[PDB]
Each structure stands twice: as C-alpha cells, then as structure tokens.
Amino acid sequence: QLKLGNSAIVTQEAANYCCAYGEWPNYLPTQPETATDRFYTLKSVKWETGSTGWWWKLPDALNNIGMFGQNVQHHYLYRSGFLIHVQCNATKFHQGALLVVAIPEHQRGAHNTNTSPGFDDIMKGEEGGTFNHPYVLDDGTSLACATIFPHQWINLRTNNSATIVLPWMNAAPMDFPLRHNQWTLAIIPVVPLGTRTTSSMVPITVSIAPMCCEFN
C-alpha cells in the first residue's frame, strides 16, 4: 500500500526504495501540498525481445495530466521532488534484466550530426521516447558507467519492482517547468527478454508521483 493524496498502488513486495543521492524530498524553509501528491501512472510500454529502452523526462512527462497538468500551465515556477515506481509484471518463467536509472540533466545528443536536438526530439510528453543507441545513453557516455546515477535493478529472477525517491536536483531554488527537465527516468533492458513459445510482451508500468510541490 502506497496511498498518496487520493489514489494509490496496492503493491505486494515493496522492494528497498532508493533514496536518491542520500536525500529525501522536503519543502523549502503557494503550496497545494495534497492534490498533486498522487501516483500519475503512465501507459504500459511494449517490452519485447528486441526493445532498446524508454526515457521519460521529468516534469515534461506530467505536463498534460490532472492537477499537475493544470498547476504547471497556470504557474511560472515549480519546486517538487519525485517518487517513481516502476513495476514490471512477469511470471517466474520469463528472464531478463532492467536498469531503472534516473538521470539528472540528461542532455541528449543526436547521431551522426552536429545539429542540436529540437523541441520535437526532447519534449515528448507523457508518451516517452525510445533510445536510439542505449549502449551510449544517446549522449556519448557509457551505459556501463551509468550506475553512478540513482539506479535500481529489475532482475526478473529476483524482483519485479523498482521505487526511486527523487529529490529537488537543481542549482536554482525554483525553476520554470516547461522549459527545463531535471530528471530523465531511463529504463534500459541490459539483459533482454527471452522465452521461446511466448516471446511477446512483458509490460512495464511507470508510476510517477510528485512530492512536496510548490508553485509561484
């Protein structure tokens, strides 16, 4: 049970949630404080034997759903931490691994061109984007070193959920929401799915919930 505001997830084996960078979301010393604290559940993404990954930029992934879709497009500054729950239902007979990482300031880079990524290639909204080269995180870095960020492992042998608690990672005290994205939740299938007669989907559910919202 994870009851925030009005709606909740009834999760069964609540795995050890990762407080990101050792911190925890808390208010700065207007504030709605109750309405926006709710689990905005995204769509279930089609994870197959040949999927490369998914990235949702926060808070661009929530600027179209509920009070937080309203409280962004009225206001001018937000300051809110996050709690991301990524739960991936699968039987015992499936195999595979996920790297559920929450990258701050994930400045992307286009392939084989010196042109900047456009507004259509960065801000996708709720739907999220697919990695084009997941080994290099689409910015020239390495996925092998990507555990330096806040990460958890969904190894479908061991567990099938990953909860990350993301704090306010910014130099500024309050930031414009539509023109900047701090965290980029990235789910990369390191070890891909595999089973013979049922090689189809194993869906992945992403449940982003803003915490400790402020607005001016």
Binding site: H74, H75, Y76, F176, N216
Partner: protein, 128 residues
C-alpha cells in the same frame, strides 16, 4: 529605472502607488489588476477580475498602495503586467470638468537588491 540599469542582476519587490487627481465630488471605480510573470495580459474585465486585483473607488481613497511580490527579473524579457480596467462610468458633477486624471508612483521596498554593477546604456555618443 535609471539606477537598476547600472546593475545587471536585480531582485526584490517593487510597489506601486496610484493617485487620482480629479475634483472632490468626482466618483467612480477602477479595478487594478496584477498579472504574475508568465500570466496572460488580460484584455477584458472578467478575465482581469480573476487576477490578484483590487477594486478602487474615488471617494476617500484617492491613493492606493499596490504591492508587487518577488520578481527577480534578470533579449525581450517580460516578468509581469499591471492593467487597470474601469469598473463604473466616471461620475462627475455638472460643475466639474468631465476629464479626470490618474498618476502613478513606483517605489522599491527595502528588500530590493542590486548586484554586478555594469555601465548604463542611457547616455551614449560635446563642446569645450
């Protein structure tokens, strides 16, 4: 205006003071409307009365101290609006002139902050 062009990154909370300058019998109502930065400039009164407004009557109140909150401004950039809509029609007696006049007074508060002194773009190009 002229001092905060000698400084690059300004901050703080301005405050306005409007003042009516008509005859003593002359009455009427305004609705002064503040729009936060990023808020749309209101065009009609019904959009404007939903902002953080004030409804000012020309009786004993011939001056309104309107406070503007923290802006921290610091390229055409715009960080707010103050639009004043006329609520009632202007009542003047037959003896007073029909045209009356408002004047404003902007003043910064004591939390106003200036830093990183640059030079002003005001004067720019003399005999003797």
């Amino acid at each position: 205006g002229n001092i905060s062009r000698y400084y690059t990154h300004w901050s703080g909370s301005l405050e306005m003071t409007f003042m009516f300058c008509g005859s003593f019998m002359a009455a009427g109502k305004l609705i002064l409307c503040y729009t936060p930065p990023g808020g749309s400039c209101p065009t009609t009164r019904e959009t404007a009365m939903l902002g953080t407004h004030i409804v000012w009557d020309f009786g004993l109140q011939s001056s309104v101290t309107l406070i503007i909150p923290w802006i921290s401004g610091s390229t055409n950039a715009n960080v707010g609006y103050v639009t004043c809509f006329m609520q009632t029609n202007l009542i003047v007696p037959s003896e007073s002139s029909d045209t009356c006049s408002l004047i404003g007074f902007i003043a910064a508060k004591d939390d106003f902050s200036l830093r990183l002194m640059r030079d002003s773009p005001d004067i720019g190009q003399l005999h003797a």
